[PDB]
């Protein structure tokens, strides 16, 4: 394509005079643009994405974090560039109780890490998800599903973190995406359980490899504050699992009243595009910043930029 290169981008940095922010992907660009525009609707900041920077090295051709780290190393010092890389599972300790070695936004010479596993983990306050699912969700019994969520989310985030951590252990990122389905979840007195279906596209060996680690982890992840759990989950898998859980709640609410409407609502939202859910959550999170106290944001990055 007609993207830049690392050297060309360093040259662009020295040439240009604007304030720049270098993020890992294209979704973070949209969300951070929303944040910046909220805090100052007339902002001359540009958010560039490492995804649109070509690297000759084959290793760097798909690792955007290495790209950001390289550009930061080669341009350390310049005062009109800021970097934002995701935290993955760095500085996270899994000894018994899941613990965060660094409890603040890591900052090292204009490079800023995300508070959780990624930008999508700021969205994981109960208030943000509960508010942002109404705007898009139809109503088989809307308020009922919202109320059932309001409680089930307490253990839901623990379970979702367990799923993400188990996937990380088995070195299969996308496994939770397809293995788990909306009909899979089970609700019991505001308790989420993940029954094991029979047929699965991946070899039954993969199914076992996941489920064993998941079962091993669950006690480990049920003994730390829900905040750490919300921090240790992954972005895309977390969003998809939350979609599935709201679908399951829809079914649980609607099963008693009408089978057809409940099935329609659940199977519908289970197909809603991930971009729509992420955009709605970003709108809710930006619109619900500061007014609450449990809703976080990259304050240090915003202070460093502008």
């Amino acid at each position: 394509s007609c993207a830049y290169t690392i050297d060309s981008y360093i040259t662009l940095l020295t040439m240009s005079s604007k304030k720049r922010l270098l993020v890992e992907g294209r979704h973070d660009r949209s969300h951070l643009y929303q944040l910046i525009y909220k805090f100052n609707p007339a902002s001359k900041v540009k958010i560039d994405t490492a995804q649109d920077i070509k690297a000759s090295d084959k290793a760097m051709s798909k690792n955007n974090r290495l790209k950001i780290e390289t550009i930061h190393s080669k341009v350390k010092g310049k005062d009109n560039i800021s970097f934002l890389c995701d935290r993955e599972f760095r500085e996270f300790a899994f000894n018994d109780q899941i613990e965060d070695l660094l409890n603040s936004h890591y900052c090292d010479d204009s490079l800023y890490w995300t508070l959780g596993h990624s930008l999508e983990n700021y969205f994981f306050n109960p208030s943000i998800i509960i508010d942002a699912f109404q705007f898009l969700s139809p109503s088989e019994y809307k308020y009922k599903a919202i109320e059932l969520f309001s409680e089930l989310i307490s253990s839901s985030f623990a379970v979702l973190a367990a799923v993400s951590l188990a996937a990380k252990d088995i070195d299969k990122a996308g496994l939770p995406a397809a293995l788990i389905d909306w009909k899979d979840i089970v609700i019991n007195d505001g308790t989420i359980k993940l029954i094991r279906r029979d047929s699965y596209d991946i070899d039954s060996a993969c199914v076992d490899s996941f489920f064993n680690a998941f079962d091993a982890v669950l006690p480990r992840v049920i003994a730390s504050d829900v905040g750490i759990c919300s921090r240790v989950v992954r972005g895309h898998t977390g969003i998809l699992l939350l979609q599935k859980l709201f679908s399951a709640c829809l079914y649980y609410v609607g099963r008693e009243d009408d089978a057809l409407q409940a099935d329609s609502s659940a199977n519908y939202f289970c197909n809603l595009s991930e971009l729509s859910l992420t955009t709605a959550l970003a709108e809710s999170w930006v619109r619900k910043i500061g007014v609450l106290e449990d809703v976080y944001f990259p304050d240090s990055l915003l202070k460093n930029i502008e």
Partner: protein, 396 residues
Amino acid sequence: IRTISKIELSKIHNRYNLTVDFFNDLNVIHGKNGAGKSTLIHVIANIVNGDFIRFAFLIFEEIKATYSDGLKIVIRRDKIDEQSFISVTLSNGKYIKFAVGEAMATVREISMLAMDIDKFVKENELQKVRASYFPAFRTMLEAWSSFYNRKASAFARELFGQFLPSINYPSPMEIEDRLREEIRRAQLGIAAYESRTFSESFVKVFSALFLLKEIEGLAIAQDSSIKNGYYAEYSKVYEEIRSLINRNVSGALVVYRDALRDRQDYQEKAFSEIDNYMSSVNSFLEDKEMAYDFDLRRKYPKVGLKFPDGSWSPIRVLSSGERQLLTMLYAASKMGDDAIVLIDEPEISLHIDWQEDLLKRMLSQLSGRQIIVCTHSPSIATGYEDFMINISPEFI
């Protein structure tokens, strides 16, 4: 109105083919040297404008252009009796066929074929939307001002072959003239509204016949404004009214506040297009400020640059990049006429800072018209990779 949806070029120059699909709002075309970028823009400009007489100057086998509305113009060049024929067939079932020899002879002279082409274009509603064309050579042609369109097109065809589209991008001189005309129209509309407001205010006062802080603020704001510099006698009126009120009901003040707010609102609405275009241009220019002055007692509005010392200069003093920015922004402004904007390398003599805000500021002017761009610069496609097309000929 309309917008190209696909283009199927076959055997262009007897060397390659192409098949491109276009979005509805913005299309960014990038590729390696030798790709049919310039030829593609030329084909889309010639097809939209209805300039089918120009296809006698291209060596092709079959071109098929489809609009969003539904038309499926299909131009076929063929050989019958060792004579080249260009047959233009629409989706309605009509068809016009003209000989290449007649087209070449007419173009050399400049005719029956031209009249027939015009009749086909007008009857079938083919000139619905024009196409602004910003060639790769804009500074040379713009400087070749010492109809602009006809002479410039003749020159550019004598240079770059006769298939080149008609060059009808808005030059800086035309931009200045059109800005001045819009200024005059705004002033005359203001005068008409002033007369009507005088009448209606007489009516409202009479009907009354059978907050002052806000009016102070409104009068102060309106007094200091280039738009309303002629009268400028607003502070005195407010001071006199305040003195009279103190010496001495409030419904008169309410009527006055309504009248002043209405005049300010109409003034904002009249200069809307010009003010918006000037603001868009001033988001770019640094150390200058495009501005106008309707004052001097010399009844001719001044449109031009304003350096930060009160020094005025004309638009002709700008550099190449600033003039190109002006031209493209106008083409995307609501003051422009033709929907489709075909810009060939909009990165010429433009800083990366401006390249990186050009498309955002052109799509932000809510014209809703299709824009096709052919760029070699990564800085123009940033933030718009979902709207980016790549064309690769299938060299035969």
